[PDB]
Amino acid sequence: ELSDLQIVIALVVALLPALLALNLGSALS
Amino acid sequence: TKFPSFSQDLAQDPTTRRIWYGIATVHDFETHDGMTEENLYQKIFATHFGHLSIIFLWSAGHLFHVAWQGNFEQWIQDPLTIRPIAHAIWDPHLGDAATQAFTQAGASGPVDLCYSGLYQWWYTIGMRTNGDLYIGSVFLMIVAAVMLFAGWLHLQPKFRPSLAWFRDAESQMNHHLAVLFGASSLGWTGHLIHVAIPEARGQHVGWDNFLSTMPHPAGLAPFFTGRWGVYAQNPDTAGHIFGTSEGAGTAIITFIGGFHPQTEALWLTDIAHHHLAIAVMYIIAGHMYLYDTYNESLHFQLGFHLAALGVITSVVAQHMYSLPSYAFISQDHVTQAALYTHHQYIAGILAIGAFAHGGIFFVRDYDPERNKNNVLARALEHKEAIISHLSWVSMFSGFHTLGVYVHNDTVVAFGTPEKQILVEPIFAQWIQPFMSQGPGDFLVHHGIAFSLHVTVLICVKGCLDARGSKLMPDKKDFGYSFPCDGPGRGGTCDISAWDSFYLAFFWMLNTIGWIVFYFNWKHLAIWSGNEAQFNTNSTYLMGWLRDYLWGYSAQLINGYTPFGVNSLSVWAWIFLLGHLCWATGFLFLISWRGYWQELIETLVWAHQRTPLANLVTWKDKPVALSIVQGRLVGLVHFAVGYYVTYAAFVIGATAPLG
Amino acid sequence: SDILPAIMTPLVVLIGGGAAMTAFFYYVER
Amino acid sequence: KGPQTTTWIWNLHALAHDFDTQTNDLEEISRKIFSAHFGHLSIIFVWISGMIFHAARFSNYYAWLADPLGNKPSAHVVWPIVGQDILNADVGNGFRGVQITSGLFHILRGAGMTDPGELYSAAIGALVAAVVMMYAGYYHYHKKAPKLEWFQNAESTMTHHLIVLLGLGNLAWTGHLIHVSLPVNKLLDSGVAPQDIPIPHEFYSDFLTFKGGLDPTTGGLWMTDIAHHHLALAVMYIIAGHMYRTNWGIGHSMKEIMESHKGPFTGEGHKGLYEVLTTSWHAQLAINLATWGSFSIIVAHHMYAMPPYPYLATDYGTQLNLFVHHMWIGGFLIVGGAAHAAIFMVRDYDPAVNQNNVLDRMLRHRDTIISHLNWVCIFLGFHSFGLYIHNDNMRSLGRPQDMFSDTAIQLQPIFSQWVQNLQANVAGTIRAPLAEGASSLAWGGDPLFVGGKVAMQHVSLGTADFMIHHIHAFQIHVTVLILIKGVLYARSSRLIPDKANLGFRFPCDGPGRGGTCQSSGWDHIFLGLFWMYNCISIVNFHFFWKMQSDVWGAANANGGVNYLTAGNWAQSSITINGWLRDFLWAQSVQVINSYGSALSAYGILFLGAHFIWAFSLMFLFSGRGYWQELIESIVWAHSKLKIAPAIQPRAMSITQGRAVGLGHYLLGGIVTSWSFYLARILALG
Ligand code: CL7
Ligand code: CL7
Ligand code: CL7
Ligand SMILES: C=Cc1c(C)c2cc3nc(c4c5[nH]c(cc6nc(cc1[nH]2)C(C)=C6CC)c(C)c5C(=O)[C@@H]4C(=O)OC)[C@@H](CCC(=O)OC/C=C(\C)CCC[C@H](C)CCC[C@H](C)CCCC(C)C)[C@@H]3C
Ligand SMILES: C=Cc1c(C)c2cc3nc(c4c5[nH]c(cc6nc(cc1[nH]2)C(C)=C6CC)c(C)c5C(=O)[C@@H]4C(=O)OC)[C@@H](CCC(=O)OC/C=C(\C)CCC[C@H](C)CCC[C@H](C)CCCC(C)C)[C@@H]3C
Ligand SMILES: CC1=C(C/C=C(\C)CCC[C@H](C)CCC[C@H](C)CCCC(C)C)C(=O)c2ccccc2C1=O
Ligand SMILES: CC1=C(C/C=C(\C)CCC[C@H](C)CCC[C@H](C)CCCC(C)C)C(=O)c2ccccc2C1=O
Ligand code: SF4
């Protein structure tokens, strides 16, 4: 019921907090 | 070696202690080298955005997985026979037998049944398609992106909040009460009225048609003028089926009371009313709105907030099974047991955490001069008294409860159950959603009473004696966590305040264990119709061992047999994993550092003297874990074991029953 | 993207765990 | 001197028997020790009198002796006061009493005692033996302390204790056997009533054979074979005792033999060991307890496989109770052996005496030994327990074909299987010749049936048996690792070079060097006791489940046995879930359902043992610190009320906390298993 377009967009969005987590982590170190 | 950057004491440790103590102290920002209170609060501030981003990506995962891999649609169609699904299993290690067995709840491939009442919660709050969930998920990833972006921006000196913004705690308290709690409460009533209740009454509200839709026909006219009457419209008929037009009312705010019969849950209208009321009260109190110490110490603040979240999550557990607010969750027994046990164990963790940071406060932050005759000063003034009283009520409640249970065991064993000391819970009868409190319930309540007493006995003897005692007058010197003062004065093992948190975690687990044991046995009895079994057998301890533990284990431990696997295989296995983990805790709790340090010396010898192997060597001289790390790893094993074993058992006990 | 499990799981557990353990190793040994 | 702190009371009880501490001279010490040994022998004589007395006075002995298959031994009647009457069981023929499992009755029948007069005579005989042994101790200590020279006379003492006791005791007993026991048992098998059999005062291939296997009537070994065996040993021991040198020019001097034995590898060899053995009690207690323990363990295996006494095989309750009792005594003694080896190494070890002898060479390569034991323990750990884990994962993953089992991947214990074929098929005319049959059916046998019950049968060996054997090897090596490490590092380590000085028991050398908790030899015995418990727990479980799944049972219509657990060992003992389900869960049904029955007491002790065990975690998991802090708050509450005691109340020593932790852990765990075994085998077997 969930289409591949949607699965990909979800991943691409999730990539954003990933980068920002790397950034915040670096900061807090 | 560089790591840990923050602690040079450790960074110059030539041993493996440097890596362990690093990881152990990596979040005690206070103790970092050259940490000024200003930077401390700023660092803390940014970390919190990290935590919240995690909680949101966690929630995001829930929604993403249930959307993609769940059976949420099929379940909304048949919410009483369809087992709701948590996520797919991809595991290259499963045999065909186990893939077949985990292929359940009409899923193509192997899945994990959900037992967090997430399906129920989402159905209740209006989500009806995988799209609603997928959007929730992508939304929540973006929220987390924003929260991460925020922590980054904040720690950037551009928007780095100075000590001012944190010294303004009073403002933060009022803001929390109103701007956060009140505002979000009525915002949530917004959601309820606009989406939850409609979708409950069979009317689809999307983000694109709720602007179009009005919750109440009489809505605008009632708003600001005669709001109470119009809002209390035709109440939803008992006939009403959740998510259908059939028997759908129109009332958005009510005080109907009791439970919707189809879903056996609190009326959405009653919840919306509740939240509106809560919002009004909170906002009003906000407008309307130990001081020294609380503002001074962040430990005092967390401690207070942990004790707070402690009681809150306890009541959440107590209320969320008695007063189900989610559709069909009352009928889903495994989920309700799971959630109760979950929230009660988290309750006990937050509670003991309160007393932990209590003791940290008393060894890092409490200045006796600063507060001349405060509550805390008076508390310490007669420690020996507070402790002697808690001691007494512990020995009293204990001796008598154990004595009575043992008396009952003995006489019942001797085949004279008549002679049992069955005490009726009269006050429980007086007060009494509420289930029959018999003499079993009485004895267990007193068990729990006693255990909660001994827990607070311990985790206050801790936070009071933290400053010192006759055995060690100056503990504040050595701090919260330290091994001992040596074998000096008859011996001082486990004299630290941290040691009291350690000794009290055991009691916290015993206490919550008695709580959730009682919960789950009572409920399994009722959910099998043999409430008689609980009532008759709960009065002697063999009844708990034979009927609760022995009796409800059978399904679980047959999860995998030589004959074959069933769906409970993974739980049988987790059950054992938890026994192993628990017991492994005994390795570290019982065997103490010196044995190991000698052994590891010999292994260092063998390595250095073995050809081919000697070519590589440690950078960090291997050493046995520290005294305290032994206690900590012991306790984490014991705890993790305890939780995992019981979680397995809760699931495996309830799942076959349903 | 039915297969995304069979890619994401080894990637995260084996490759990511490996890379994480390698990185943490460098981190605590440098 | 004075009792100032509560610790004094504890210390009193602790070091009361530490003669080494209380005294300075081997003379006064050896006197105390000899006197005590007498005291102790009297305690055992009292106890033996008690057993034969209870068998006489409060027993179904005579009924049993009449019809063993029918009756169940019960020499233990309980006074009815609080409704404990129920513990008295219907053991048959209307006798109501606690079904005893000691096998006393089998002992007496084997001794050929059929007369109530005879049994009372035996009781009073043993009781006067007690009355004289305690007085003998008093005489030899107070009246007439013995001489140091006598003690150090190990060659005399050997010759004596080996002919006077072993050779002569075996001849004496073979007399008592062939004359009293053997013909009485023959008559009782022929069916002569107990009353009909004559009293003792009234009074070579026929009575001495090499039949092997079991008497198919009694189920025991042919008492002909017993007589011949004991005679054989009498012969052997008479000779062997003649092979030493006491107060004459004839024999081998031990010191000569010892010092002779050196070699390339062992440097100066045994030179100095005679000296330490003679001068050090602890060295003797070490060697002895180690061999005594090892003996109890051989006892356990031998008595189940070659059930000596008549009808014992059929009595599954005794066969189990005796295997398990002897295993416990074995493990406990082996560990006390290690203990006293460590106490020796700390106290009674002189570098002067031991100089490049085998003992010094041990201490000099003690890291290679600990390191290698460490390795073999990790290895065995993984390749025993890890094979069970493997199987738990494979079976739970529904990949039974990937498991270690008789099916799928197979670990056949071929060495053992081979020895088994070599003992079953090799009956006669190999090495020691003219053996009519196998020493036991365990090697290879079709089930011998005494009544419905299988007396003894081929104890098979498959993957389950390879696995559990490696589990035993693993746990014994870990226990050796802990114990040999506590011995060889009792004097010193890289961590604490002055451990000898810190003592045998000391809680630690304080928190430095990373922490030195439990670094003493005593602390090694502490940890060794938990591993001996884990080891013997699993040996007793291996016995119980293998016996009751593969050996014991009932003969039905068909030749086939109705095994107690129906052969689930082969497939269920190869996973931990197997053990949890098909052993502890499945088989605890008797003990948990024992309330309001004969076996209710086993139910209560199952619970109470669970409680004592959990309670010991209070001691093992916590430290003296917390307790002394709390104790002093409680004292403040007695001070307020002017109840504060004269003897200041002190939290127990660090070492005492550990010792009681361990005591309660052991008592709880052992009693728990005991309850479970008894309930299951009294009810089912
Ligand atoms: C892209 C959106 C996404 C999110 C938000 C998400 N997952 Mg999944 N994810 C899993 C857990 C999970 C958790 C615990 C979790 C909660 O944060 C999430 N996920 C969340 C396991 C069920 C399974 C494991 C394989 C594996 O993990 O898949 C890769 C998952 C990724 C790309 C999502 C990464 C995003 C998470 C937000 C990161 C969370 C970080 C955390 C907050 C920081 C603290 C660390 C902590 C340890 C202290 C999995 C799957 C999987 C996928 C995919 C595509 C995803 N996911 C996707 C997501 C598998 O194929 C695959 C699946 O199909 O399996 C059949
Ligand atoms: C459990 C009770 C407890 C709670 C709930 C709690 N703390 Mg403390 N707490 C902190 C903050 C804090 C925050 C922000 C917080 C939020 O609510 C809490 N705490 C809460 C920091 C001030 C400070 C920093 C702590 C510290 O620096 O944190 C770093 C420690 C880390 C990275 C390792 C933690 C590893 C986990 C233990 C084990 C997880 C097991 C896992 C599930 C795997 C299972 C496998 C699988 C089968 C599932 C801290 C203290 C400390 C303690 C103690 C005992 C506590 N706490 C206790 C608690 C210190 O001594 C210690 C201290 O330094 O005192 C002097
Ligand atoms: C547990 C293994 C062990 C064994 C089998 C063993 N010892 Mg030692 N042992 C001695 C001799 C000895 C003898 C003669 C002997 C004979 O078999 C043994 N031992 C055996 C003494 C020389 C010497 C002192 C003896 C001395 O301390 O013993 C006095 C008696 C004591 C305190 C009572 C202990 C009570 C038990 C805890 C409870 C057991 C009872 C029963 C199970 C049922 C429970 C009762 C019920 C009410 C619940 C000794 C040492 C000592 C130790 C230790 C650890 C041991 N041992 C250990 C053992 C010293 O510290 C200690 C020492 O101080 O080091 C030198
Ligand atoms: C079965 C498990 C178990 C029991 C029974 C137990 C027992 C108790 N723990 C106490 C405390 C604690 N326990 C602590 C840590 C732990 N305790 C643990 C496990 C237990 N602890 C574990 C695993 C830990 C982590 C180390 C701490 C840190 C404390 C306390 O401060 C607290 C305390 O001391 O409070 C003052 C007491 C709490 C009840 C009380 O005050 O008096 C009630 C007494 C009870 C319920 C047991 C009594 C047993 C019986 C009645 C005694 C008589 C039995 C026989 C007649 C005795 C004679 C036997 C001879 C004949 C052989 C009590 C002594
Ligand atoms: C379940 C409880 C428990 C476990 C598992 C345990 C484990 C062990 N104890 C050992 C020793 C000891 N234990 C001691 C005191 C105690 N030990 C206790 C309880 C335990 N001790 C308790 C309660 C005490 C207090 C008395 C002492 C005093 C010693 C030793 O000297 C001895 C030792 O160190 O010898 C060297 C080791 C035996 C040698 C070995 O390495 O075997 C191999 C490891 C085993 C059997 C544990 C599980 C291994 C399984 C197969 C997992 C395989 C690994 C997988 C790949 C999992 C990895 C997962 C990651 C990828 C995340 C081993 C680490
Ligand atoms: C078993 C045991 C040990 C020995 C256990 C040790 C030393 C831990 C063993 C090492 C574990 C297996 C992990 C270390 C190796 C990992 C491979 C490290 C990976 C992380 C690196 C990047 C740092 C103790 O040190 C000890 C100390 C105090 C009380 C009880 C005990 C105790 O019970
Ligand atoms: C509980 C506990 C204690 C406290 C336990 C004590 C002090 C036991 C001693 C008290 C008992 C009750 C002995 C009996 C005292 C007198 C005999 C009282 C008279 C009793 C009459 C009524 C008969 C420790 O001292 C300790 C030390 C080291 C590690 C762990 C622990 C530990 O766990
Ligand atoms: S923690 Fe270890 S070192 Fe410290 S007092 Fe206790 S036993 Fe001694």
Q: What SS3 string covers B454-465?
A: HHHHHHHHHHHH
Rounded distance, CA D384 to CA B383, Å? 53
Residue B177, classed as helix, strand or coil, is helix
Residue B221 tokens read as 């006219």
Q: Are B291 and B374 in contact (CB under 8 A)?
A: no
Rounded distance, CA B484 to CA D397, Å? 46
* Residue B604 neighbours by CB distance under 10 Å: 18
Which experimental technique did the depositors report for determining this structure?
Answer: cryo-EM
| Residue D350 CA: distances (Å) to CA of D124, D275, D280, D500, D501 | 48, 10, 10, 11, 13
Residue D111, classed as helix, strand or coil, is coil
Q: How far is B541 from chain A (nearest CA, A)?
A: 51
Q: How far is B8 from chain C (nearest CA, A)?
A: 14
Residue with tokens 């006598």: D150
End-to-end CA distance of chain C: 40
Strands D448-450 and D453-456: antiparallel
Which helix (DSSP H) or strand (DSSP E) does residue B315 occupy? Answer: helix B298-322
Q: Are B581 and B644 in contact (CB under 8 A)?
A: yes
Contact B88 C5 (CB under 8 A): yes
Ligand 7 atom closest to Cα of residue D649: 7
| Residue B504 CA: distances (Å) to CA of B341, B419, B465 | 19, 35, 14
Which helix (DSSP H) or strand (DSSP E) does residue D211 occupy? Answer: none
Rounded distance, CA B201 to CA B626, Å? 61
Backbone angles phi, psi at D349, to 5 degrees: -105, 125
Q: How many helices (H) and strands (E) does chain B have?
A: 28, 4
Q: Are D570 and D464 in contact (CB under 8 A)?
A: yes
Is the bond into B4 cis (omega within 30 degrees of 0)?
Answer: yes
Which helix (DSSP H) or strand (DSSP E) does residue B86 occupy? Answer: strand B85-88
Which helix (DSSP H) or strand (DSSP E) does residue B236 occupy? Answer: none
Backbone angles phi, psi at D97, to 5 degrees: -170, 165
Using alpha carbons, select from D111, D119, D110, D112 the residue that is nearest to residue D60: D119
Using alpha carbons, select from D260, D252, D250, D205 the residue that is nearest to residue D231: D205
Using a CB-CB cut-off of 8 Å, the residues of chain A touching C1 are 4, 7-8
Nearest CA in chain A to C3: A4
Q: How far is C12 from chain B (nearest CA, A)?
A: 13
Residue B559, classed as helix, strand or coil, is coil
Q: Does B646 touch chain A (CB under 8 A)?
A: no
Residue B39, classed as helix, strand or coil, is helix
* Residue B615 neighbours by CB distance under 10 Å: 7
Residue with tokens 């000096």: B488
Using the Cα atoms of residue B125, residue B130, residue B134 and residue B137 in order, give the sign of their dihedral: positive
Q: Are B71 and B39 in contact (CB under 8 A)?
A: no
Rounded distance, CA B254 to CA B233, Å? 8
Rounded distance, CA B278 to CA D304, Å? 75
DSSP class of D588:
T
Rounded distance, CA A28 to CA B46, Å? 7
Using alpha carbons, select from B136, D266, D659 the residue that is nearest to residue A2: B136
Rounded distance, CA B517 to CA B511, Å? 10
Q: How many helices (H) and strands (E) does chain A have?
A: 1, 0
Which helix (DSSP H) or strand (DSSP E) does residue D553 occupy? Answer: strand D553-555
Using alpha carbons, select from D125, D1, D115 the residue that is nearest to residue D61: D115
Contacts of D632 (CB under 8 A, 6+ apart): B384, B469, B470, B471
| Residue D450 CA: distances (Å) to CA of B177, B246, D213, D612, D679 | 83, 76, 13, 40, 23
Q: Are B630 and B592 in contact (CB under 8 A)?
A: yes
Q: Are B443 and B404 in contact (CB under 8 A)?
A: yes
Vertex D454 angle, CA D452 and D460, to 5°: 150
Strands D89-90 and D553-555: unpaired
Number of residues written out for chain C: 30
Residue B156 tokens read as 């950037």
Residue B515 tokens read as 């709580």
Using alpha carbons, select from D574, D569, D545, D567 the residue that is nearest to residue D392: D574
Rounded distance, CA B327 to CA B125, Å? 9
Backbone angles phi, psi at D89, to 5 degrees: -100, 150
Vertex B431 angle, CA B427 and B434, to 5°: 115
Rounded distance, CA C15 to CA C4, Å? 15
DSSP class of D516:
-
| Residue D614 CA: distances (Å) to CA of B561, B642, D666 | 30, 14, 11
**Which B residues 51-90 touch A at CB under 8 Å?**
53, 57, 60, 64, 67-68, 73
Using alpha carbons, select from D47, D50, D101 the residue that is nearest to residue D74: D101
Using alpha carbons, select from B106, B103, B112 the residue that is nearest to residue B565: B103
Residue D107 tokens read as 């002992």
Out of D21, D26, D282, D343, give the residue to mutate to test ligand 3, the one with the largest number of ligand atoms within 8 Å of its CB.
D343
Using alpha carbons, select from D444, D8, D128, D504 the residue that is nearest to residue D286: D504
Q: Are B4 and B26 in contact (CB under 8 A)?
A: yes
Rounded distance, CA B299 to CA B362, Å? 9
Which helix (DSSP H) or strand (DSSP E) does residue B629 occupy? Answer: helix B627-657
Q: Are B622 and B15 in contact (CB under 8 A)?
A: yes
Using alpha carbons, select from B361, B592, B642 the residue that is nearest to residue B487: B592
Rounded distance, CA B560 to CA B571, Å? 9
Residue B493 tokens read as 């093992």
Using the Cα atoms of residue D430, residue D435, residue D437 and residue D440 in order, give the sign of their dihedral: negative
Q: Does A8 touch chain C (CB under 8 A)?
A: yes
Residue B422, classed as helix, strand or coil, is coil
Q: Which residues pair with B603 in a beta bridge?
A: none
Using the Cα atoms of residue D213, residue D219, residue D224 and residue D226 in order, give the sign of their dihedral: positive
Using the Cα atoms of residue D26, residue D27, residue D29 and residue D35 in order, give the sign of their dihedral: positive
Ligand positioned closest to the Cα atom of B110: 1
Residue D648, classed as helix, strand or coil, is strand
Number of residues written out for chain A: 29
Vertex B613 angle, CA B612 and B614, to 5°: 90
Using alpha carbons, select from D380, D293, D368, D374 the residue that is nearest to residue D336: D293
Rounded distance, CA D670 to CA B38, Å? 59
Strands B265-266 and B259-260: antiparallel
Helical residues (DSSP H) of B201-297, grouped into ranges:
227-231, 268-288, 291-296
Which helix (DSSP H) or strand (DSSP E) does residue B367 occupy? Answer: none
Residue A26, classed as helix, strand or coil, is helix
Contacts of B358 (CB under 8 A, 6+ apart): B299, B303, B459, B462, B463
Rounded distance, CA B436 to CA B256, Å? 25
Using a CB-CB cut-off of 8 Å, the residues of chain B touching A1 are 73, 129-130
Helical residues (DSSP H) of D89-203, grouped into ranges:
104-110, 116-138, 148-152, 154-160, 168-176, 182-190
* Residue D596 neighbours by CB distance under 10 Å: 17
Using a CB-CB cut-off of 8 Å, the residues of chain A touching B144 are 17
Q: Are B557 and B572 in contact (CB under 8 A)?
A: yes
Rounded distance, CA B606 to CA D372, Å? 8
Rounded distance, CA D279 to CA D148, Å? 10
After what residues is chain B interrupted, C–N > 2.5 A?
Answer: 289, 432
Ligand 2 atom closest to Cα of residue B26: 27
Residue B337 tokens read as 């047991």
Buried (b) or exposed (e) across D181-215, using 16+ Cβ within 10 A?
bbbbbebbeeeeebeebeebeeeeeebbebebbbb
Residue D450, classed as helix, strand or coil, is strand
Which helix (DSSP H) or strand (DSSP E) does residue D487 occupy? Answer: helix D463-488
Ligand 1 atom closest to Cα of residue C9: 25
* Residue D613 neighbours by CB distance under 10 Å: 18
Vertex D595 angle, CA D592 and D601, to 5°: 90
Which helix (DSSP H) or strand (DSSP E) does residue D269 occupy? Answer: none
Rounded distance, CA B516 to CA B507, Å? 14
Residue B448 tokens read as 């729990």
Residue B410 tokens read as 């003995």
DSSP class of B158:
G
Q: How far is C1 from chain A (nearest CA, A)?
A: 6
Q: Are D387 and D576 in contact (CB under 8 A)?
A: no
Residue D124 tokens read as 């009073």
How would you class B247 by CB atoms within 10 Å of its CB: exposed for 0-12, middle for 13-18, buried for 19 or more? middle
Q: Are B10 and B4 in contact (CB under 8 A)?
A: yes
Q: Compute the distance from residue D626 Cα to the ligand 6 centre, in Å.
A: 26
Question: At how many Å resolution was this determined?
Answer: 2.5
Ligand 2 near B574 CB (within 6 A) = no
Ligand 4 atom closest to Cα of residue D621: 26
Strands D96-97 and D553-555: unpaired
Q: Which residues pair with D562 in a beta bridge?
A: D554
**Which B residues 21-50 touch A at CB under 8 Å?**
43, 46-47, 49-50
Question: Which residue's CA is the nearest one to ligand 5's atom 51?
Answer: D386
Q: Compute the distance from residue D657 Cα to the ligand 8 centre, in Å.
A: 12
Backbone angles phi, psi at D76, to 5 degrees: -140, 85
Radius of gyration of chain D (CA): 28
How would you class D533 by CB atoms within 10 Å of its CB: exposed for 0-12, middle for 13-18, buried for 19 or more? buried
Q: Are B623 and B17 in contact (CB under 8 A)?
A: yes
* Residue D219 neighbours by CB distance under 10 Å: 25
At B290, the amino acid letter reads: L
Rounded distance, CA A29 to CA B497, Å? 29
Rounded distance, CA D535 to CA D334, Å? 12
Q: Are B511 and B452 in contact (CB under 8 A)?
A: yes
Residue D650, classed as helix, strand or coil, is coil
Backbone angles phi, psi at D91, to 5 degrees: -95, 5
Q: Are D415 and D504 in contact (CB under 8 A)?
A: no
Using the Cα atoms of residue D131, residue D132, residue D133 and residue D135 in order, give the sign of their dihedral: positive
| Residue D676 CA: distances (Å) to CA of A6, D600, D607 | 59, 11, 10
Q: Compute the distance from residue B15 Cα to the ligand 2 centre, in Å.
A: 23
Using alpha carbons, select from B472, B481, B514 the residue that is nearest to residue B642: B514
Using the Cα atoms of residue B122, residue B127, residue B129 and residue B134 in order, give the sign of their dihedral: negative
Rounded distance, CA D435 to CA D445, Å? 15
DSSP class of D146:
-
Using alpha carbons, select from B535, B543, B548 the residue that is nearest to residue B441: B535
| Residue B214 CA: distances (Å) to CA of A2, B125, B277 | 30, 18, 21
